[PDB]
């Protein structure tokens, strides 16, 4: 019933706090001692901050949650009595493959071997492993403590049990898992994100709207609805049901989509134009970027609270 | 300094409440007496509801705001002393053209003639009008009282003054206007929306994810960020600035985008599959659709409050 975090970096620390809120004993393992010390320190500080703002997940006190998080130096011992291992090392294929191969030689047939990978495919990560049926990608969204989505991406040989157990576990710790039925480049979130970016880029390039105004169309417009309801249910409600929406607007959708330009090169004049507008709003230096991210995260924290209430 | 609403229907009522919150005297005009009576009644009720939940815009009491809203039977008299006329009749080109032609013969050179049209282009709406320099499309987003975005779409002959004045007026009543520099099919919001829908549709069709799970990827994931920050600034912050983001992810974006399938037909098997999933979540009947929209709107109302606070 214990959980093991391999790599106590940024995402590993978030996972640690999520699992602890669910009452799970969490073990932290890292190749760098300073990352473990830093993780325990930051987790304690973040936990207290959340407590003070009444933003802690679950019903366990910050104190009890912190007591559930410890570190292990020996991997072989670290996997003892663990039912879920969440890998959180850098986004590097060679490295992740090595990690899973090392785990593959010491785990039993019960434990789920889960990767936090942002884009690497399960087929490239787990093929050839003895315990491949227990492998899966459980991709969170930064910042995981505020954004609940977790993309569960299976390997073609991943067992239904592994997917079901992980879906249930993610739900248990307060996250919102989704079943990506078949692996695909960019999974689901990034494919949707890139779809938006592609059209937005061309709109700016063609002089339809300034970069700043395009962002407003989303943040003070379309994005507000998307924080509560997806694009499909949105159609469903903006007419008398999905059938009605297609009957009324499918012609227009096809017409607009047919007018879409080519795939952007993401460089040259347009990157300069977009970057200039972005830097005007938020200077591209460590201080201003961090400050804006902090604001963004606070917004997400409050939105998370609002969503739970609704 | 007065405002005239032509067509006191759903959007006309929203506009009336927006302008009144800004302290503007609002005149309602409609070809159907029952729509005026219904508008005054619903506005009064909505105003009181907002007041009770502490959701009224501006610093004027619900009582004072309501006193600023009245009706006129004669259009010629209705345009007297008005600086902005917001047309809110049905989305029908022949009809809107007739409305603007009727206004064109009685207004001065100061008043702005603004259409709420959801998709009709300024070139089709205002060409040939004597007062074309004063024409513009000011497209709000339902529900306008909670979603601030207003797309300002000009006619090629629309004067800068007309655009500037309307931008300032929209900002004065608490809305978030954007300057769509050149008219285009679907303006900006719908082009972005359709971009998302197109990819989402193919993902469901190809069995990558269920309709319900796809919606969750947005509502409990990507959509949360988009409620505060647009797609471009999002890139800017998810790396060390826009340049950094493109350097790190442009290759992947192009690769994913290149894999995108063709434009959907929005019918057949997939429409049946999507509709079935949507109806399972929200039955396609008047009662359940209205209930879900009510929930959605309440979420947006609270999000609007949250955004203003942040
Ligand atoms: N930062 C976030 O919020 C998110 C991260 N991701 C993914 O999660 C993974 C980790 O990301 P981050 O935390 O941002 O990076 P990071 O660099 O902060 O953390 C990686 C951790 O891995 C440790 N590590 C390196 N080699 C190791 C080894 N052989 N054995 C054990 N530990 C080792 C490092 O010491 C470090 O603490 C990546 O694949 C990333 O794409 C997914 C979603 C969001
Ligand atoms: N409902 C909303 O929230 C939004 C509406 N839109 C656009 O706003 C426009 C109006 O939409 P709705 O309020 O939903 O429809 P609606 O049908 O409720 O309102 C139209 C009003 O026009 C009046 N009308 C019809 N012919 C007239 C004439 N010759 N002179 C004066 N009044 C006349 C009708 O009596 C009715 O009260 C459309 O072009 C729509 O696409 C834009 C954004 C959102």
Swiss-Prot record, chains A, B:
GO terms for biological process: fatty acid metabolic process. Changing residue 30 to R: Reduces enzyme activity and alters specificity, so that NADP can be used as cosubstrate. GO terms for cellular component: cytosol. Its EC number is 1.1.1.45. Detected in eye lens, kidney, liver, heart, lung, brain and testis. Inhibited by malonate and by inorganic phosphate. It catalyses: L-gulonate + NAD(+) = 3-dehydro-L-gulonate + NADH + H(+). Homodimer. This is Lambda-crystallin. It comes from Oryctolagus cuniculus. The gene is CRYL1.
